[PDB]
Every structure is written in structure tokens, then in C-alpha cells.
Design an enzyme around this catalytic site. Structure first.
Site, mmCIF file in Angstrom:
data_model
loop_
_atom_site.group_PDB
_atom_site.id
_atom_site.type_symbol
_atom_site.label_atom_id
_atom_site.label_comp_id
_atom_site.label_asym_id
_atom_site.label_seq_id
_atom_site.Cartn_x
_atom_site.Cartn_y
_atom_site.Cartn_z
ATOM 1 N N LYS A 144 7.733 -12.170 20.227
ATOM 2 C CA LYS A 144 6.423 -12.647 20.592
ATOM 3 C C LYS A 144 5.849 -11.262 20.473
ATOM 4 C CE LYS A 144 4.037 -16.119 22.763
ATOM 5 N NZ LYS A 144 4.012 -17.330 21.411
ATOM 6 N N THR A 203 8.651 -18.730 21.723
ATOM 7 C CA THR A 203 8.191 -17.093 21.783
ATOM 8 C C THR A 203 7.319 -17.637 23.115
ATOM 9 O OG1 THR A 203 6.886 -18.355 20.947
ATOM 10 C CG2 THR A 203 8.665 -16.807 19.529
ATOM 11 N N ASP A 204 6.678 -18.577 23.415
ATOM 12 C CA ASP A 204 6.211 -18.709 24.860
ATOM 13 C C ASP A 204 6.817 -17.892 26.017
ATOM 14 O OD1 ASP A 204 3.478 -19.932 25.928
ATOM 15 O OD2 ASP A 204 4.860 -20.800 27.091
ATOM 16 N N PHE A 240 -2.806 27.441 1.545
ATOM 17 C CA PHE A 240 -2.347 26.622 0.585
ATOM 18 C C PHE A 240 -1.884 27.019 -0.588
ATOM 19 C CE2 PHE A 240 -0.935 22.995 -1.393
ATOM 20 C CZ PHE A 240 0.489 22.889 -1.920
ATOM 21 N N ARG A 254 -8.919 26.627 4.627
ATOM 22 C CA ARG A 254 -9.204 25.648 3.934
ATOM 23 C C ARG A 254 -9.510 25.204 5.946
ATOM 24 N NH1 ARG A 254 -3.851 22.330 1.917
ATOM 25 N NH2 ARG A 254 -3.078 22.686 3.748
ATOM 26 N N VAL A 275 1.147 21.848 5.386
ATOM 27 C CA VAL A 275 1.554 20.927 6.494
ATOM 28 C C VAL A 275 2.935 20.953 6.802
ATOM 29 C CG1 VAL A 275 1.358 18.731 7.377
ATOM 30 C CG2 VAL A 275 -0.879 19.642 5.337
ATOM 31 N N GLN A 276 3.696 21.792 5.637
ATOM 32 C CA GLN A 276 4.755 21.494 4.977
ATOM 33 C C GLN A 276 5.648 21.822 6.511
ATOM 34 O OE1 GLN A 276 3.417 20.749 3.013
ATOM 35 N NE2 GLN A 276 4.209 18.926 1.262
ATOM 36 N N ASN A 307 -2.569 14.641 5.372
ATOM 37 C CA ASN A 307 -4.155 15.392 5.148
ATOM 38 C C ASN A 307 -4.892 14.714 5.112
ATOM 39 O OD1 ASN A 307 -4.656 17.860 5.138
ATOM 40 N ND2 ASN A 307 -3.474 18.148 3.172
ATOM 41 N N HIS A 317 -8.419 15.715 3.690
ATOM 42 C CA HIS A 317 -9.294 16.148 3.369
ATOM 43 C C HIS A 317 -10.712 16.583 4.272
ATOM 44 C CE1 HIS A 317 -5.770 16.174 0.998
ATOM 45 N NE2 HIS A 317 -5.549 15.154 0.884
HETATM 46 O O1 LIG Z 1 -0.759 21.345 3.125
HETATM 47 C C1 LIG Z 1 -0.470 21.223 2.281
HETATM 48 N N1 LIG Z 1 1.084 20.281 1.516
HETATM 49 C C2 LIG Z 1 0.729 19.502 0.316
HETATM 50 O O2 LIG Z 1 2.237 19.774 0.044
HETATM 51 C C3 LIG Z 1 -0.309 19.805 -0.620
HETATM 52 N N2 LIG Z 1 -0.597 18.914 -1.693
HETATM 53 N N3 LIG Z 1 -2.159 19.470 -1.227
HETATM 54 N N4 LIG Z 1 -2.556 20.039 -0.899
HETATM 55 C C4 LIG Z 1 -1.656 19.985 0.137
HETATM 56 N N5 LIG Z 1 -1.187 20.588 1.263
HETATM 57 O O1 LIG Z 2 7.673 -22.540 15.151
HETATM 58 C C1 LIG Z 2 7.989 -22.707 16.749
HETATM 59 N N1 LIG Z 2 9.056 -21.405 16.543
HETATM 60 C C2 LIG Z 2 9.061 -20.461 17.463
HETATM 61 O O2 LIG Z 2 10.134 -19.920 17.695
HETATM 62 C C3 LIG Z 2 8.088 -20.283 18.626
HETATM 63 N N2 LIG Z 2 8.913 -20.730 20.033
HETATM 64 N N3 LIG Z 2 7.234 -21.328 20.915
HETATM 65 N N4 LIG Z 2 6.940 -21.913 19.610
HETATM 66 C C4 LIG Z 2 6.974 -21.893 18.741
HETATM 67 N N5 LIG Z 2 6.605 -22.362 17.573
HETATM 68 XE XE LIG Z 3 0.627 20.538 10.255
#
Ligand SMILES: O=c1[nH]c(=O)c2nn[nH]c2[nH]1
Ligand SMILES: O=c1[nH]c(=O)c2nn[nH]c2[nH]1
Ligand SMILES: [Xe]
Ligand SMILES: O=c1[nH]c(=O)c2nn[nH]c2[nH]1
Ligand SMILES: O=c1[nH]c(=O)c2nn[nH]c2[nH]1
Ligand code: NA
Ligand code: NA
Ligand code: NA
Ligand code: NA
Ligand SMILES: [Xe]
Ligand SMILES: [Xe]
Ligand SMILES: [Xe]
Lengths: 295, 295, 295, 295
Positions: free
Chosen positions: B10, B57-58, B159, B176, B227-228, B254, B256
Site C-alpha cells: 500500500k 493491501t487494504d 567555478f 556566482r 558543488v562537488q 545546481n 541556475h
Molecule cells: O558546481 C558546478 N559543478 C559542475 O560540475 C558544473 N558544470 N557547470 N557548472 C557547474 N558548476
Molecule cells: O488486485 C488486488 N490485489 C491486491 O493485492 C489487493 N489487496 N487489496 N485489494 C487488492 N486487489
Molecule cells: Xe552545495
């Protein structure tokens, strides 16, 4: 057939601006998304393929960047008014500009209890917005808002005494969860033009802050009789604190959290006073709105 | 043909739990989204329409609520381990349970400088997550993570010195904007079972807090060469502070922000040292990953 | 500490290509989103701030556009293989390229029963995808897939005879709605290099078409005993029709539609044989997976 | 302070309905998302915590299901009118109902060239919508729409002769890509009540079909001088074909695809007449609107 209404422009223009204080080394960033739509004597672009009346939406985009370069971008009420005024003054045949601005949060980081000079965090998707309508000869209409403010209280919310008829299954309750996403809009009195907007500049940030504070305090402290009753209390207080606001509008979803009856399983008690585990419901949701103005 | 691998269960089970302190009146809420997938001797449900091997699932959904009712839901590493163990112990033919938990933020509100007893705010879409794999006879493998932590610094990122060939147009830079959404995962040494997980319970919250703090501090303070290089510094520090972690993985976009040349317009200067207004780019984005382990 | 694994590159690179037939005037468009991540002798960029080993992600982006200009972009299995091969051959220290491609639908419009020469419609968010891993000295591994294919049948689905214990509330049923979003992946036998991929080019589109057709037919015609049983039938048929596929994987949500008991209202009958109005559930959902290979 | 405007109700109510033909065995499914907001004499719920005037939003949800059980859900204009009328007639103090319906596509599958009796596919996220405002004593106002119809043409779009000033960088073009997501709304003349809406029932599906067909044909065949000029042609034709429509509104994003200059790389030619590879832009986008009515 005839053109009854027309507007066109550029939407989703992302803008970032940085301010660098040379004395302190402190930097402050602003990031917004801007939409500008224009109206005026432009019907012939629709009816006659006459592009001569069109200020290209690409040029509108350029203008937004140029205006942000040459002017403060805060408060957004002022920036929007400058931007809208530009178009109606620059172009004879454009008579209305509609500017929507969404401000994104970049909150200064605290590192080891000290405010960092140039590092920021997005603390929540809450936005501060403005809608500015600049209409030639009719001044500047500004609606300011906050949106995306998501809150929950786990008790001190009630809902009983509602109409019960043959369509009703909802049980009355004296203790429930209340959770919502707040959308609140305050509409300023009409301003005659840019000089008047400039004269009220300090009120914009202060009123936003007041609206936010009132919303949070009232939500937390009201022993809520309904979403309706609580939101009205919010709007009433905002109007009392800022005379230049004409109306306050709230739009609030009621985001439901349902009790789960577990009694089928070994008599486990998880309802009423014993309710501990709940199922948040993605949909449907109540939606409650109200606009409050002055008597 | 044959079943080579199968798992079912669920997904998207939303759970909220409240804890009420009767002495202080203080309430604390937890909200999660849970996924549980099971493996075992279940091939015949696929190949022979033999439903006798299927735990519906109910029923899995019911079990999640029942388990949350009867057990603490924090730290999520412990809750996930309890939940996964339940399935492999209860059902003879189920031999593995895979539990993913996303924890949503509900941060207690401060109203007038005081922590409110039962009101909460969603401060950002940042999540704390766990993946717990409980495999019969092989113990409990836990990967903990934070995700959706969005940050930006407006200077002190560089950068330059990258490979330049006939595919390169990117200019070297000594100043930047750097902005990213942090996804960081720390993988715990294998635990023999629930008793061992319980014995380390205090380390889970503390290590999450350390991972977060190291990420923020290093991001803010590193005069970043890439960023790296910056992310490697983060991972190295986390491994140094928690001996029970085997590996740390970072995955960082990132995001921009491009300079906008405005010189075509009245010689306006908005590049290099004069850059104030930038265009955030929605796409494409750099994506940088690394897994750091012990020598 | 040491770098255990590292990969980096450019994600979310949107590409559109048009082919213009000069004889017929017919135009055909292709639109994709591409991600390329590289691996190799690049540890020093992380550990020593040595950028000399980095092919800038911006250059990777340029390379994608240049490669699309000079090569067919269809089938995506071929385009991905060309793109991945380029990086491992061009750069001595890069030893693996991982290319993911999402193909977006632009389906030619029919206007007045005739195929239009240059107008297209996005008929659904269904995607055709590839993952291509090009590893120096180990050939080319290709996984092809379709995703976002959303279907529903209103009857001829059953689910009974599952395990019932003290966690079970689900009632057995002989007639239910079944709805899912299909994610299906077929993994090709390893190819020795680009020459071999080129030799199988016609099989890629044909196998995609077969996978789609088998999925739709089996879903519509199977009197389904469970999601498990129906999906196994799909995978078995795909493997029988294409000998160059080693495995087929399906991942299927069970998107629930619940009966609504309306009997509380004037004895209205809306369950079992009388069920007409149902409540689609946004969450939670069953999630069922299986990988089928050859005996 | 005073309540100037208020409305409240239930949003995001998902509804599915199946029709079973006993003679032919053919089943037809309908799936919608419904929002109902009410207005009337409800101010006291806001100002006095008087819940006695509130028809609970949970009851509104029940009413939607009950109404869908007892009435056809197609065309949505009729279903919305029935639903809105119910509230103003049932409740003395409710004087307006606002009903929004989004219809989701479930298109019957063709298997081996034959229409399948009970299997369906979601062919695209295009929606058919209605907004129905039922106001006591003022009749029924219906706006019908289609939205999410995404199209692209690869040639036969131009844009030249626009205003050029010191804010303009955009080059004139005689051959570009045009792509948009169509939002089209047609507003019906006011209806006096449900009897009148029933009398026009066949016009609703036919007019939707006409609006769709006109949009697609005009888009594909117009040698477009601008978005403005093309959309006006669409609206003019719809008004000519259905006398009961008063206005047609289009709202169209201009989703830009940019040329990529590759000449820096070995003189590769990819602009103007040689343009084959383009970069789709996620943002910003033009946004063009117009409302066309009768002379
Ligand atoms: O911080 C950054 N890392 C990147 O890899 C990158 N590529 N373009 N600008 C960037 N800025
Ligand atoms: O098709 C269904 N599968 C399930 O596993 C389920 N559980 N509740 N209703 C359901 N219907
Ligand atoms: Xe960052
Ligand atoms: O069709 C268009 N209309 C416009 O108003 C516009 N502005 N820039 N490009 C444009 N294209
Ligand atoms: O606060 C509430 N207001 C309402 O109108 C309502 N209807 N159901 N539950 C509700 N809760
Ligand atoms: Na003007
Ligand atoms: Na077991
Ligand atoms: Na190589
Ligand atoms: Na009424
Ligand atoms: Xe509220
Ligand atoms: Xe299925
Ligand atoms: Xe258009």
C-alpha cells in the site's frame, strides 16, 4: 461580432535581485514571479491582423528586468505600481496595466546564532502577493495578499448546531482538528497615482506583518465555533488596525482529518476522547470565503 | 517465463497522530505518509491466480493505523522497524518488508514569544524520511534522509578551471549564485533486529539534527570551488560525527541563475561586478551526486 | 573517508526537433526531455577541488543539442546510445554515461479526415522512455518503457480468496472497478556497442508498439482475478513476442473506487448490484510490482 | 465592520457514475470533480457564531452523490443546473448556488478495431468544464468551456510588424513554431430556470463539439499573423454557429520554442531556414486573452 474585452502580456517572468551593502558586506535577495497584462486600443490586432498596436510580450519581459534594475523591488506594492505606471505613460494607446507579483521567501540563515551575510533558506512555500491595476485617469488599485500559509490546531475547534435534515450525516462535535491553508487579501483604498503610493510606502510591509500576525494569533487563540466565525474575527481586527484598507477577503479550505474506528480490532479505542490516530483526507474539502468591509 | 522479483503493498497512506500531555496540557502532532511493500512466497498469486498467499493491501493499510495506535511513531526509524518486523513475524510466507516514511513538518507556533500548546505551522516542504528494509534472517537496514531543503547563497561560490574543448561555451567565474535543493541520505550499519534498533533510539534524532546542521553550516561558510567540492565536505563531517553511519549520499541540483545583459538598452550595466538582476532558470539544471564511505 | 560512487551531469534538458520532407511538405516533430549523467575518474573534483576532470554540465547540455542536430532522434534507444557512446569515446577519463530520455506525444492532427502536414496535438501525458547505460568495455544496456498510460474497466475484475485474519476488513468481491496507471519496462539483452544497436533499430518501435498493444488488450479482455494475475499475463506475452528482451517489469497502482452506501437516505440502493455512483479515492493506493524473466 | 460577500461549500468532490445497458451489455462511465458554493442569508454564522443557518459542507457532499444517483450526469450543463436548483429550492435562506464541474476523459478503448463494452482510456488531460450560477429570481447562468487542449504547429505562424522601440529586442519573423494550451469559454444566454435548460439539452454536447472542431481546424489552417488574430477567427466562427451563445472567451499562452545558435561549434547551421533543433522554454510565456461578443 466585436471585441468586448482584451488583455495580453507576459506571464511567469521569474526575477531575482540582489542588494549589496558595501559598508557591512551584507547581501539581501529578492525573488519574484511577475505577470503583466495590458489593455488599450489594441482591438485591431485581433480583428485586422494589425500588429502595429502590439507592444511585444517579449518587450514587456525586457521592461520588467529594466524596471527592476532601476528601481527598488520592495515593497512589491510599490514595484508593481512603478511597473504598471510605466506602461500607461509610455504608450499612448495603452490605458490599463495589470501587474501580479508573487514574492518567494528567501529568509536569511542563522549560523551559530548569528545572521549570515549572504546565505538564505526557503522556509515554506508561503507567498506574499500583490495585484496592481493601473488604469489611466482612474489611479492605482492595489490588492495585497498572503497565501500558502498552512496551519493546524489539534483541539479547541468545535462544530455543532448546524442545520440537520434528511441530507445530513455529519455528527456534531465539541472537539476536532482544524487545519487550513490561509489565503488573505486586503484591498487598499484607491490611490491617485504613484506619488500617493510612495507617500504610504511604510504602511505596506507593516500591514502585511499585521495581517500575518492577526491571522496566526486568532487561529491559535480562538476557541473556534466554525471556520466562518474564526475568519470573521481575523478580518475585523485587520480592518481595525489599518484605516487605509477598505476590504479584507479570506478564502479558507477546511482540510479534514477523520477519526479512524479501530474497535473491530480487539476492541481498540480510537474515537472521541480516545482518538489518537487520524486519517488526513486529501479531498473533498470544505471551502469557506468571506469579504468583510466597513459599516 | 518465471517471476524473478515481486513486491506489493500500500502506498500513500497518510497518518496523523496526536500525543496529549495531561499534566501540562501540551499537545504534539506527527503527520507522515507511509508506504509498505512486502516480498515472500507470493509468486502463485501472479502465476496461478492463487490469492491465498495475499495479505490484502487494504489489510496492510489497517495494520499501519493499528501499529501507529499501539506504538510511538517517533523517531521514524523506530516506527518503520516496528512496522516492518510485524509483517515478517506475523506471516510465515512473507520474508521481507520495505517501509518508506515521509515525515511532514508541523512546527509549534510561537504566539507573543511563547510556544503554543496545540497550534502548529507547516514551515516549509522540507521532509525527513526513512527507508527501512526488514529481511527475515538478515536484520534491518535503515536509510535516513532529509529532502526538500532549498537554499541559496548570493556570493562565495566559484567555478573555474574545468575542461574546455570544442563543446564548451561556459565562462569561468569567481563569483556566482549557488542554489540547490538538498537531498541527503545516511545509511546506518545493519541492525540485527528490533532490540538493537531500540538500543540506538537516541542517535536517530541527534544524527538527523547533525546532518541538517552540517549541511547548512558548510553551505553557508564554504567558499565553494564547485558543488562537488562543497558536498564532499558535508559528507565527510557527517561520517566523522556518527560512527554508526556507513555511507552518506548527497544528490544536489545546481539551480541556475543567469546574468541578464541589459547593455543594449542605454548602455545599462548589469553583468559581472555590476550584476544585480538575474533570471532564475527553471530548467535545465545540473545534477551532482556522490556517495562517501569510510576508507 | 573516500568517494564510493559519483555521477554528475545535466537533467531536464528539453529538446525539440523537426524533420521537413521537401517532396511532400510534411513535417514531423519530436520533443524529449533528456538527462545525462557521467561517471569516471572524477573523484578529485570532490576531494581536491580539481575541476580539470570536469566536463561542465553546461557543455553536456550543448552536446545534447549538437548530437540531436547531427543524428536521428528516433527511435530514442538509438539516440540515447549515440549520445552515451559519444561521452565515453570523447573523454579518456569518463567511463560510463547514463542517458534517460522521456518522449512527449505530439500526434499529427486529423482535420476533415485528412492527416495535417504540420499540426499536432498532445493526446495524453503517456510517455515513452528509455534508460541507456553505456559502460566502457561492457557495452550498452537499454531499458525501454511506457508510463502514464491510465486505464479503467468498469466490470470484469474480481478479488476474492485472499488471506483473512484479525487485520482484515476488506470484503471479497466478484465485480469491481479496476483502474491503474501503467508503468511497463522491458530490458534488452546487452549490446556490444553502437553497431549492434544499429542492427536492431527496427525492433525498438515495433516492440514498444507490441508492449502497448498487449497491455491494452490483456487489460480489456482478462476477467481479472487480481492485479497480480493480470499483469503477469501481460509480461508473459511480451517476452514471447520479442526474443531480444530479457525481462519485463510492471509497476501498477490499484486506484480505488469505493461504493457509496446511500441507504441512510430514503433507503436509496447504491451498493452491490445496484452500485452506480462511486467515490474515486485519491489515496492511499495499492501498488503492485513484478519482474518476469525467462525460465 | 460588516459582511460584504460570503460563500461557502464543498470543493474537490470526485464523482464517478456508470451506466449499464442491459440489452447490449455496454457500459459507459462518467467521472467529474465538483465544487458547490452557496450564498444567502448566512451572515450570522460569521458574525454571531450562529451555525443554525449553515447547511454543513459534508451535507453538500452527500447531496452531490444523491443527485448524481437520481439524475443524468450528462450533459454537465444539465447536471449542474439540477444540482444548483436543488439548493435554492430546498433551503429558504439560500439564494444562490455556484456549481463548477470538471469532466475527466474516459474514452472507450478500441481493441482489434472494435469498441470495447467496458474498458476505457484517459486520452489526455483535456477537460470539459461548466460553471453554473443559479440565482433565486434571476434564472441560471451557464458558462461552458474546454481547457487543457495542447497543440503545436511547426510552421505557418508569423509575427512581424509589431511596435519597435528602445525596449524591443525581438526580431520579426515569417516562420515560427506556435504552441499553446487552449482555454475556451462560451457563455450561454441566461435561462429562466430548469425547464428552459432541459429544452436546450441537445445543444450542449453539439456546441462543445463545434467549439472543439472550430478551435482545431482554425489553428491548423490559419496562416497565423499572431495569436491575437488567430484566436479572434476561432471565436467569430463559434458565435456564428450557435445563436444561444452570447460571448466566447479565449485565454491562450504562447509557449515559446527558441532557436539554438550552434554556429560557434564548427560553423553548424541551426537558425532561420536551417533551424531543426529548438529549446522549448518552460517560462516565461506570452498570455493572450480576448472576449468576443455580438455587434
Ligand atoms: O558546481 C558546478 N559543478 C559542475 O560540475 C558544473 N558544470 N557547470 N557548472 C557547474 N558548476
Ligand atoms: O488486485 C488486488 N490485489 C491486491 O493485492 C489487493 N489487496 N487489496 N485489494 C487488492 N486487489
Ligand atoms: Xe552545495
Ligand atoms: O502572437 C504573438 N502575439 C504577441 O502579442 C507577441 N508578443 N511577442 N511574440 C508575440 N507573438
Ligand atoms: O467550520 C465548519 N464550517 C462549515 O461550514 C462546515 N460544514 N461541515 N463542517 C464544517 N465546519
Ligand atoms: Na497610455
Ligand atoms: Na515471515
Ligand atoms: Na572514456
Ligand atoms: Na432559497
Ligand atoms: Xe480558521
Ligand atoms: Xe492490471
Ligand atoms: Xe492560436
Amino acid at each position: 461580432s466585436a471585441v468586448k474585452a482584451a488583455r495580453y502580456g507576459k506571464d511567469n517572468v521569474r526575477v531575482y535581485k540582489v542588494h549589496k551593502d558595501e559598508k557591512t558586506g551584507v547581501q539581501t535577495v529578492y525573488e519574484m514571479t511577475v505577470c503583466v497584462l495590458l489593455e488599450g486600443e489594441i482591438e485591431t490586432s485581433y480583428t485586422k491582423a494589425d500588429n502595429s498596436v502590439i507592444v511585444a510580450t517579449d518587450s514587456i519581459k525586457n521592461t520588467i528586468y529594466i524596471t527592476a534594475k532601476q528601481n527598488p523591488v520592495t515593497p512589491p506594492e510599490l514595484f508593481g505600481s512603478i511597473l504598471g505606471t510605466h506602461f500607461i505613460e509610455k504608450y499612448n494607446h495603452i490605458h490599463a496595466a495589470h501587474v501580479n507579483i508573487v514574492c518567494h521567501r528567501w529568509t536569511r540563515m542563522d549560523i551559530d546564532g548569528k545572521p549570515h551575510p549572504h546565505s538564505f533558506i526557503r522556509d515554506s512555500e508561503e507567498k506574499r502577493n500583490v495585484q496592481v491595476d493601473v488604469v489611466e485617469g482612474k489611479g492605482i488599485d492595489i490588492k495585497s495578499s498572503l497565501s500558502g500559509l498552512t496551519v493546524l490546531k489539534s483541539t479547541n475547534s468545535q462544530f455543532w448546531g448546524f442545520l440537520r435534515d434528511e441530507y445530513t450525516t455529519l455528527k456534531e462535535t465539541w472537539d476536532r482538528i482544524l487545519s487550513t491553508d490561509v489565503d488573505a487579501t486586503w484591498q487598499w483604498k484607491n490611490f491617485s497615482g504613484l506619488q500617493e503610493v510612495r507617500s504610504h510606502v511604510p504602511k505596506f510591509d507593516a500591514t502585511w506583518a499585521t495581517a500575518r500576525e492577526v491571522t496566526l494569533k486568532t487561529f491559535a487563540e480562538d476557541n473556534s465555533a466554525s471556520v466562518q466565525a474564526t475568519m470573521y474575527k481575523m478580518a475585523e481586527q485587520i480592518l481595525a488596525r489599518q484605516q487605509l484598507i477598505e476590504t479584507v477577503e479570506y478564502s479558507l479550505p477546511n482540510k479534514h482529518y477523520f477519526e479512524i474506528d479501530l474497535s473491530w480490532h480487539k476492541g481498540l479505542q480510537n474515537t472521541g476522547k480516545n482518538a489518537e490516530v487520524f486519517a488526513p483526507q486529501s479531498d473533498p474539502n470544505g471551502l469557506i470565503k468571506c469579504t468583510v468591509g466597513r459599516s
